[PDB]
């Protein structure tokens, strides 16, 4: 049971309890306002307490995708959008400037609220801010954070890729090609992220989707099943053999493995041309 | 360099080369049509080859977010939307039914194009489809794929969380709370996903965002800096000490560590009241 404020690109959800001046709590790394709710119990006699789920977290939901650039460590999109969210929330809840407390990265949102929308701040508390930009050694801390994040994300993706590799039962010609890594750290990372997306959002949904053999017999005349010559014994060939066994739909052998259309493009083309020429 | 077809929820990007009847290549696990360009070069004198970046991949781009339900293994949203993308693309390029070849999971898209939009299909090829739904004992293969994906994603997340934990120089009280398990397996994983989002899309961007000390001095009488009593020696306290050193803005000590507001909510509230009530 949370309140909603619809904003450009997101539905912002927040908790609210109590009476008095508005006091907005901006969460840090956990992103959600439930973490303030025991504190809110202590304050509801003297403040109208508002604990926000920031738009990328919790019960808040995006209505437009994040820009592709938000993964750049130099992007200012999210922090500025979060600060605008707090300012429009303040404005919906009172006509007088409100109290604001942010913790950790949420204290950084708070600082951007004060910088860009000072008119909404009556008083503000920055609880243990980890901002480094104005520090004498800001370049060191920025580089250190960047190395830490890269290490965490890289080790997690590498473990996922290693475990994926442990399950793979694939043909040698495909394994050669599947092992070719991109030429930059960023491109390898993108390959890993793409694999993780396919695993979570595609393989189960598509391989158990609603197709029956009756869907194929209705138009059997249009269909050709293709098995690679270099991928024999693999599970997808067994699928084609079953379709063919039960429908009579023809199997055509074609050069290469599961990736035969890039392994042996000339031979693959020759078969397609025979099939459909 | 690619062509663009704007559809509901996405800009669909595709390679187009050649002459003659349209032939649409639907990519499998890599999601992108560049993998077919060598084959396209072999075929372009005989077919107008169209090689698609499916809408979640490559140069295609979503204009609305995926439904939260898409991570459910029984969701049919993406496979059906992919099939509709192909049928709309076919209708935009040819008045007559077209040739289609899909590979692997892209051949499952092709099956749904034939099922739901047979009027765009002249001939179709299924290259090594991995669909199990109509196979005898389909449930074995479904359960195996679900176990595989679960093991990959969760072992990757756990390694990332492990590596994150090794980098933390944090106070006893905060670690004790970080170390407390979430009640559910779903809640564990959600905490892990939230941490990975914060790492990639929040910490570097916010901690090196454009705040200067001048921004604080301009409204110094509005601001209170807060240091936990149980997190002494932590980096965020050094930040507050520097701001105070440079601006005169006061530091207030407050019970707890970095998570003091939920560790010791009455003490935290008591200080906020002495501050603002
Ligand atoms: Ca959510
Ligand atoms: Ca490693
Ligand atoms: Ca894209
Ligand atoms: Ca079945």
From Swiss-Prot, chains A, B:
Keywords: Hydrolase
A molecular-function term among this protein's GO annotations: hydrolase activity
UniProt-listed Enzyme Commission number(s): 3.-.-.-
Top-level lineage group: Bacteria
Boundaries of every AB hydrolase-1 domain copy: 21-138
Annotated region (Disordered), positions in chain: 58-77
Cellular component terms (Gene Ontology): membrane
A Pfam family: Abhydrolase_1
PANTHER family in alphabetical order: HYDROLASE, PUTATIVE (AFU_ORTHOLOGUE AFUA_2G14860)-RELATED, MONOACYLGLYCEROL LIPASE
Family classification: Belongs to the AB hydrolase superfamily.
Annotated protein name in UniProt: Uncharacterized hydrolase SAUSA300_2518
């Amino acid at each position: 049971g949370m309140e909603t404020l619809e904003l450009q690109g997101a539905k912002l959800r927040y908790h609210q309890v109590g009476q008095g001046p508005v006091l907005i709590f901006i969460p840090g790394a956990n992103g959600t306002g439930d973490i303030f709710l025991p504190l809110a119990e202590q304050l509801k006699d003297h403040f109208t307490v508002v604990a926000v789920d920031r738009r990328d977290y919790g019960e808040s939901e995006l209505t437009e995708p994040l820009p592709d650039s938000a993964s750049n460590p130099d992007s200012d999109y999210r922090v500025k959008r979060d600060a605008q969210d707090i300012a429009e929330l303040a404005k919906s809840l009172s006509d007088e400037p409100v109290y604001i407390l942010g913790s950790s990265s949420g204290s950084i949102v708070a600082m951007h609220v004060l910088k860009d929308y000072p008119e909404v701040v009556k008083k503000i508390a920055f609880h243990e801010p980890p901002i480094n930009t104005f520090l004498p050694d800001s370049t060191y801390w920025k580089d250190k954070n960047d190395d830490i994040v890269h290490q965490i994300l890289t080790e997690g993706l590498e473990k996922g890729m290693k475990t994926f590799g442990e399950t793979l039962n694939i043909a040698p010609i495909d394994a050669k090609m599947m092992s070719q890594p991109a030429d930059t750290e960023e491109g390898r990372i993108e390959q890993y992220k793409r694999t993780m997306f396919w695993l979570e959002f595609e393989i189960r949904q598509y391989t158990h989707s609603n197709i029956t053999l009756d869907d194929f017999t209705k138009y059997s005349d249009k269909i050709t099943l293709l098995n690679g010559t270099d991928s024999r014994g693999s599970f997808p060939q067994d699928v084609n053999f079953y379709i063919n066994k039960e429908t009579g739909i023809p199997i055509v052998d074609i050069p290469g493995g599961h990736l035969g259309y890039i392994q042996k493009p000339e031979g693959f083309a020759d078969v397609l041309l025979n099939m459909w020429g």
